[PDB]
Amino acid sequence: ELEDGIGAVAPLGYFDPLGYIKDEETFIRYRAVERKHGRVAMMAMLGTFVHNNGWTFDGYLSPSQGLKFSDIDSGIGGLFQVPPAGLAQIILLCGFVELAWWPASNLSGDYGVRLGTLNDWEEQPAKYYRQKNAELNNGRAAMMGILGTFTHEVITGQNFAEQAAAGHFSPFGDGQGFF
Amino acid sequence: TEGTNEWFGVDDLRLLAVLFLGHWAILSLWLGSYGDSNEDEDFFGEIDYSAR
Amino acid sequence: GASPSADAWANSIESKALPFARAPATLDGTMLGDFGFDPLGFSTVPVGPWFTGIEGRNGQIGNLNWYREAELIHGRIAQVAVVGFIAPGLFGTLPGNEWTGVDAYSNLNPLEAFSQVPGLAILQIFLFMSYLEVRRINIIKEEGENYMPGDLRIGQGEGRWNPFGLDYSPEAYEEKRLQELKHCRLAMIGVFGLWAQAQASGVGVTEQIGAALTTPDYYAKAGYFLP
Amino acid sequence: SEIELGATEPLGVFDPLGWLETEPEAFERRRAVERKHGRVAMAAVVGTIVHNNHIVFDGYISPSNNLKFSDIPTGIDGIFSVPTAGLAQIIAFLGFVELAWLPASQYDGDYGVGYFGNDILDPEEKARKLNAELNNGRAAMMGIMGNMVAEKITGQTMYEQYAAGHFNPFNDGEGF
Amino acid sequence: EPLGLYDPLGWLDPEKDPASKFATFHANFERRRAVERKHGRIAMVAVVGMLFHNADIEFPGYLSGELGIRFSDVPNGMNGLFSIPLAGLTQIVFAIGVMELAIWPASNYSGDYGTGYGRPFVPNVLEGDELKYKLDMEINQGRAAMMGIMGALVG
Ligand code: CLA
Numbered sequence: 001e002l003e004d005g006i007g008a009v010a011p012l013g014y015f016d017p018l019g020y021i022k023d024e025e026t027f028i029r030y031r032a033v034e035r036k037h038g039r040v041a042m043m044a045m046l047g048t049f050v051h052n053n054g055w056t057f058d059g060y061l062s063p064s065q066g067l068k069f070s071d072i073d074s075g076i077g078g079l080f081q082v083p084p085a086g087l088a089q090i091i092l093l094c095g096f097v098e099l100a101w102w103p104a105s106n107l108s109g110d111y112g113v114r115l116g117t118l119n120d121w122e123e124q125p126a127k128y129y130r131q132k133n134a135e136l137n138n139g140r141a142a143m144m145g146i147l148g149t150f151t152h153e154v155i156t157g158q159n160f161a162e163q164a165a166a167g168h169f170s171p172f173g174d175g176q177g178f179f
Numbered sequence: 180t181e182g183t184n185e186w187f188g189v190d191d192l193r194l195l196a197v198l199f200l201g202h203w204a205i206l207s208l209w210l211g212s213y214g215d216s217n218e219d220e221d222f223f224g225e226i227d228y229s230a231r
Numbered sequence: 232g233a234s235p236s237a238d239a240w241a242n243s244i245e246s247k248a249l250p251f252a253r254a255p256a257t258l259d260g261t262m263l264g265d266f267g268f269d270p271l272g273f274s275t276v277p278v279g280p281w282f283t284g285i286e287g288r289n290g291q292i293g294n295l296n297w298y299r300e301a302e303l304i305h306g307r308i309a310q311v312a313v314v315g316f317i318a319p320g321l322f323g324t325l326p327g328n329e330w331t332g333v334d335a336y337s338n339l340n341p342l343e344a345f346s347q348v349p350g351l352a353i354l355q356i357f358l359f360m361s362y363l364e365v366r367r368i369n370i371i372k373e374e375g376e377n378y379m380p381g382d383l384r385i386g387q388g389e390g391r392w393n394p395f396g397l398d399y400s401p402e403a404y405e406e407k408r409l410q411e412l413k414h415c416r417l418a419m420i421g422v423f424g425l426w427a428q429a430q431a432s433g434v435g436v437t438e439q440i441g442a443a444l445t446t447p448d449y450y451a452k453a454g455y456f457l458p
Numbered sequence: 459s460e461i462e463l464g465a466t467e468p469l470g471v472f473d474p475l476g477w478l479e480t481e482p483e484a485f486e487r488r489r490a491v492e493r494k495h496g497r498v499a500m501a502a503v504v505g506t507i508v509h510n511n512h513i514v515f516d517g518y519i520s521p522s523n524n525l526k527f528s529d530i531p532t533g534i535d536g537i538f539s540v541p542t543a544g545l546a547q548i549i550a551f552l553g554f555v556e557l558a559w560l561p562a563s564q565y566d567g568d569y570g571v572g573y574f575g576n577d578i579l580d581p582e583e584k585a586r587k588l589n590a591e592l593n594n595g596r597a598a599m600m601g602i603m604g605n606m607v608a609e610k611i612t613g614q615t616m617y618e619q620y621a622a623g624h625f626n627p628f629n630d631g632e633g634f
Numbered sequence: 635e636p637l638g639l640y641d642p643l644g645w646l647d648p649e650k651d652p653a654s655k656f657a658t659f660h661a662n663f664e665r666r667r668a669v670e671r672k673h674g675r676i677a678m679v680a681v682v683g684m685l686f687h688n689a690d691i692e693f694p695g696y697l698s699g700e701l702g703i704r705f706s707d708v709p710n711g712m713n714g715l716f717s718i719p720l721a722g723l724t725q726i727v728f729a730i731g732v733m734e735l736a737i738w739p740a741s742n743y744s745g746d747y748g749t750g751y752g753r754p755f756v757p758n759v760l761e762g763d764e765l766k767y768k769l770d771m772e773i774n775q776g777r778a779a780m781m782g783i784m785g786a787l788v789g
């Protein structure tokens with residue numbers, strides 16, 4: 001919300017530098033998207049932290065196709081390694097949350113998820129502002145991290161485990177790009 | 180050696196020195212009239228009659 | 232209703248650096264070196280001195296003294312790091328003991344010369360860079376709101392350190408401020424290219440320019456065999 | 459307030475140099491230095507237990523240098539055995555934490571996060587945990603200094619010394 | 635104004651009172667015109683799709699360099715999109731997803747995204763009766779392509 005100053009944190013303040021908020025109704029649409037994109041991209045960043053660390057389940061993801069958990073790539077192509085009969089299950093459960101349980105039509109972003117004494121907002125309202133800003137700020141940093149993780153695999157061809165094993169962290173002197 | 184591909188015929192660095200010193204000498208005289216001349220003074224003719 | 236920066240793009244004066252792009256209203260003209268260059272609108276969202284604590288984290292409206300503070304010593308460091316990227320390759324290097332190891336100070340690639348010199352060399356450089364930043368913070372704790380950006384109390388005016396006299400006239404002093412700022416912005420671009428070429432070539436810049444400003448060994452004329 | 463915390467039961471307000479009555483203007487920075495030196499030493503003491511218990515991560519901290527995490531010594535020489543480009547990455551991030559995230563020019567030490575996130579509602583339950591941070595912080599200052607001089611005097615790290623049973627300083631070969 | 639009831643020359647049967655029974659959002663006429671126009675526009679670029687693939691305009695080059703799949707390898711029948719890698723088909727309907735929400739948002743039931751008719755980069759604005767006339771031709775050729783696909787995909 002604008003009046004509490006939820007997204008405006010202390011390094012930059014009200015960081016709308018290109019002038020996109022020209023009234024109050026288009027802020028609530030944009031914050032509903034920013035908070036939703038931040039919640040998706042945070043679980044996307046914890047995915048790449050877990051996948052590129054090699055932490056896999058034991059057994060077969062698809063035993064009728066013989067596809068182990070170990071032979072899914074930890075990079076940007078690992079989701080499509082998965083058989084489409086299997087990730088139709090992912091789209092159908094996540095689509096059921098998006099329409100019924102956590103309806104993404106709710107622009108407020110509240111879905112009542114309260115983990116009680118870890119947020120007693122009625123007796124410490126400063127913890128409300130701390131946890132509301134940190135949901136956006138960790139979502140904004142993970143939105144740029146997953147755009148980092150995606151394009152670093154595209155321009156190098158290696159995933160994050162492979163380009164860190166090679167020490168390939170500089171776009172200069174390598175055989176890739178015109179630099 | 181005359182058929183060799185030298186820049187301005189400079190095969191010894193004596194010749195490079197007198198090219199610089201000759202060109203900088205008339206430059207230094209020319210800067211006595213056109214040094215200390217303002218860069219932002221423009222005109223809207225085909226020809227300028229600024230100063231001496 | 233509207234953003235505080237959407238109203239700075241509503242006034243949106245004519246620019247000079249980007250004369251097709253209509254610089255925002257927060258570049259008032261009253262700052263040194265403002266040429267109307269803010270296409271991303273950072274001056275519309277001004278920063279405060281966050282390092283002084285939480286009460287200094289907010290930035291006051293229309294005050295770019297901390298953006299200019301970060302601009303000035305990004306450029307002051309960058310200026311002295313052009314020479315640091317160049318002068319070991321030009322004026323030779325320093326010798327080493329058996330303690331530091333011989334050829335420790337001799338790596339003409341400037342980036343792996345960081346990883347070749349001893350750690351006590353870097354630690355004492357970092358602590359000297361630390362000491363003048365302690366001197367900076369102590370100036371910004373005294374001056375506060377009357378703190379001029381880039382002031383380490385070195386030079387001409389009030390009770391500053393002036394071992395050279397340096398007693399400029401009061402508007403040849405603002406030309407020196409503009410000469411400093413234009414060299415700050417230029418050497419920031421220059422030290423980026425030095426850092427990027429040292430990675431891309433693997434050698435120093437005198438060692439890449441000097442190899443390109445020389446004729447190749449297969450192209451070199453045998454030369455001057457006429458008696 | 460802050461001038462009565464740090465003063466617990468067995469000593470009261472303990473200032474043998476008398477700088478509370480002499481220089482009260484310098485106290486709240488000197489409290490901030492005491493709290494920061496405490497919090498640094500508490501992570502430093504806990505670190506020496508974890509290092510000397512041979513809890514290492516895996517692999518190489520610097521594969522160019524061919525230097526594993528277990529190749530780091532567990533004593534004084536451990537943070538200086540880390541390569542110069544690696545040590546510069548720690549200090550650059552710790553300067554980002556100590557100037558931007560937890561700015562140490564803020565002298566009340568209060569950075570938005572509470573005690574496990576919560577603000578201590580009760581004002582003397584707050585003062586009890588404010589004293590427990592200071593007292594554990596003051597005890598860890600002597601703990602990390604007592605671990606640093608006792609390594610460089612006995613010549614062995616804390617695992618080395620404890621392996622050897624070099625606990626009694628009166629029947630070994632030392633001074634006195 | 636492309637949402638009028640006067641384009642497609644009239645008329646057909648049901649008017650579908652089952653639509654307003656318990657799913658009353660789908661009973662709106664403006665969406666059914668927006669669906670018929672959108673099903674028409676997709677169908678029209680699908681017949682040219684089965685004209686270009688079936689004439690073996692295969693492509694110059696590889697489709698996937700690391701799977702080793704050239705463009706001549708994918709079939710020409712209706713199993714074309716289900717024979718490319720799913721890492722590639724994901725990029726296709728990701729880009730349609732930016733089209734479906736950001737660029738040409740399908741919540742805009744008018745279908746007019748400010749493009750004109752025949753001219754890219756600058757819209758050819760049609761003005762009068764010919765504007766009126768080209769709208770029903772879009773629907774009428776959209777309808778012939780909708781029935782042409784189910785005649786070209788059963789056999
Ligand atoms: C999901 C995307 C998204 C959306 C809808 C928003 C929306 C908002 N942000 Mg947030 N933000 C985001 C991601 C997003 N943000 C990310 C990833 C960061 C980290 C860089 C931030 C950092 C940030 C800060 C620090 C602040 C905001 C604030 C705001 C609010 C102010 C209006 C504004 O600037 O809109 C943005 C304009 C648009 C979304 C429309 C333009 C769309 C562009 C053209 C798409 C092109 C993007 C390009 C492909 C990739 C960009 C990354 C690239 C530079 C590498 C608004 C609610 C302010 C606030 O909340 O104040 C109360 C505020 O202080 N944002």
Ligand code: CLA
Nearest residue numbers: 461464465470471472477488489491492495596597599603
């Ligand atoms: C360097 C960290 C540090 C700092 C800045 C302080 C500062 C303070 N202490 Mg604390 N304290 C510390 C560590 C520190 N202490 C340690 C390590 C212990 C023992 C574990 C204590 C035990 C203690 C008690 C019981 C009390 C205080 C109190 C105070 C306050 C008294 C006001 C004053 O001016 O005292 C005098 C000035 C100082 C203490 C600053 C130190 C300056 C000298 C030069 C340091 C020299 C020490 C010496 C070199 C150490 C050699 C041994 C070492 C190498 C192992 C002041 C805020 C009182 C308080 O909390 O007030 C309500 C109080 O009751 N201190």
Ligand code: CLA
Nearest residue numbers: 597600601602603604605607608611612619624625626627
């Ligand atoms: C933070 C708390 C702390 C704790 C729990 C310890 C614990 C220890 N220290 Mg450490 N140490 C500390 C802080 C601490 N130290 C500090 C702040 C310093 C100075 C910076 C030191 C400097 C130090 C040295 C140089 C040595 C130790 C040693 C030890 C071990 C003690 C063995 C012993 O017999 O001590 C002896 C008991 C005392 C020192 C306390 C009595 C104090 C009186 C004044 C001594 C009087 C002796 C005298 C001859 C009279 C004896 C009479 C008696 C026989 C009846 C023990 C593990 C020894 C070791 O090798 O293990 C690592 C050792 O050589 N410590």
Ligand SMILES: CCCCCCCCCCCCCCCC(=O)OC[C@H](CO[C@@H]1O[C@H](CS(=O)(=O)O)[C@@H](O)[C@H](O)[C@H]1O)OC(=O)CCCCCCCCCCCCCCC
Nearest residue numbers: 073075076077080154157158159700721724725728729732
């Ligand atoms: C309302 C409903 C909402 C539903 C939302 C559901 C969304 C589901 C999540 C979608 C996540 C996003 C997927 C992105 C696609 C991707 O990952 O590619 C997967 C492949 C992986 O390849 C890989 O490459 C690897 C090669 S190597 O091993 O690394 O060498 C290899 O290992 C691997 O097998 C191979 O697969 O990556 C690439 O091909 C790089 C693609 C580059 C970017 C594509 C751009 C997409 C087009 C949009 C452009 C803008 C459009 C606007 C203009 C019209």
Ligand SMILES: CC(=O)O[C@H]1CC(C)(C)C(=C=C/C(C)=C/C=C/C(C)=C/C=C/C=C(C)/C=C/C=C(\C)C(=O)C[C@@]23O[C@]2(C)C[C@@H](O)CC3(C)C)[C@](C)(O)C1
Nearest residue numbers: 500501503504571572573574575594597598601602604605
């Ligand atoms: C955002 C942020 O930053 O944090 C957030 C999140 C978080 C972390 C959840 C929160 C919390 C709670 C925290 C941090 C709790 C941690 C407290 C801590 C770390 C307390 C150490 C005490 C050590 C002592 C007393 C040493 C004694 C002295 C000893 C043990 C010695 O004698 C050393 C020794 O070598 C010798 C000298 C002699 C030997 O005989 C013994 C040995 C060998 C051992 C916060 C802080 O609320 C806010």
Ligand SMILES: CC(=O)O[C@H]1CC(C)(C)C(=C=C/C(C)=C/C=C/C(C)=C/C=C/C=C(C)/C=C/C=C(\C)C(=O)C[C@@]23O[C@]2(C)C[C@@H](O)CC3(C)C)[C@](C)(O)C1
Nearest residue numbers: 510511512614615616617618619620621622623624625626
């Ligand atoms: C060199 C190398 O390799 O390393 C070596 C080094 C070294 C040092 C040699 C090693 C060792 C041996 C060590 C250190 C052994 C230490 C063992 C240890 C620490 C043993 C604690 C006992 C406490 C008890 C039983 C408490 C009873 C408590 C009771 C009955 C109570 O009621 C307590 C109470 O609080 C309550 C619960 C209830 C209250 O109402 C009442 C009170 C307050 C009274 C190792 C392992 O060999 C490794």
Ligand SMILES: CC(=O)O[C@H]1CC(C)(C)C(=C=C\C(C)=C/C=C/C(C)=C/C=C/C=C(C)/C=C/C=C(/C)C(=O)C[C@@]23O[C@]2(C)C[C@@H](O)CC3(C)C)[C@](C)(O)C1
Nearest residue numbers: 084085087088091720723724727728729731732735736737
């Ligand atoms: C069952 C199975 O096998 O599944 C397989 C196969 C399959 C189906 C192929 C796969 C897929 C892909 C799927 C399912 C979904 C992707 C979905 C989607 C929807 C992707 C777009 C998001 C919109 C973006 C990025 C940009 C907006 C960007 C902008 C700039 C704007 O909005 C512009 C705007 O705001 C301003 C700036 C200004 C104003 O004038 C207003 C507007 C609004 C115009 C899977 C799931 O991977 C695997």
Ligand code: KC1
Nearest residue numbers: 167169519520521522523540541542543544545547548551
């Ligand atoms: C921003 C992302 C990022 C990248 C991409 C990255 C990469 C590398 N890190 Mg770094 N790093 C951080 C961030 C990043 N690091 C952070 C947040 C911290 C906590 C403060 C941190 C700590 C250390 C320490 C102690 C060392 C270290 C190293 C390397 C080196 C390993 C390859 C090699 O050395 O062969 C590669 C290039 C070692 C080193 O520099 O050795 C000379 C080393 O000792 N890192």
Ligand code: KC1
Nearest residue numbers: 154697698699700701702718719721722723725726727729
């Ligand atoms: C933003 C720039 C961009 C890059 C840099 C890029 C890169 C790659 N594309 Mg992608 N792509 C688009 C954008 C980009 N792609 C767009 C706008 C579309 C139209 C919607 C699109 C469509 C497809 C299809 C159908 C396929 C495809 C592929 C690859 C793959 C080569 C794999 C290889 O080298 O073996 C590399 C990484 C193939 C594939 O992913 O196979 C596993 C594949 O079948 N692309």
Ligand code: KC1
Nearest residue numbers: 061062063064065082083084085086087089090091093094
């Ligand atoms: C309600 C109980 C339930 C049953 C009884 C069941 C059964 C199977 N699932 Mg499972 N599933 C969920 C629930 C159930 N699934 C849920 C809540 C999710 C998260 C949304 C989920 C996700 C995936 C993914 C990613 C894959 C997957 C698969 C299979 C397949 C294994 C044998 C096979 O290989 O056919 C058998 C039929 C794999 C697959 O379909 O491979 C073609 C595959 O990759 N599933």
Ligand SMILES: CC1=C(C#C/C(C)=C/C=C/C(C)=C/C=C/C=C(C)/C=C/C=C(C)/C=C/[C@@]23O[C@]2(C)C[C@@H](O)CC3(C)C)C(C)(C)C[C@H](O)C1
Nearest residue numbers: 646647673676677680683684711712713714715780781783
């Ligand atoms: C009016 C009413 C009637 C009605 C009706 C009628 C006709 C309704 C209309 C139905 C209409 C809606 C039917 C169009 C489908 C076409 C859509 C766009 C999908 C195309 C599918 C495209 C994506 C095709 C793609 C491919 O081909 C391509 C490009 C390449 C190949 O490698 C593979 C694939 C498959 C990817 C009643 C009810 C019957 C009774 C009474 O008479 C009155």
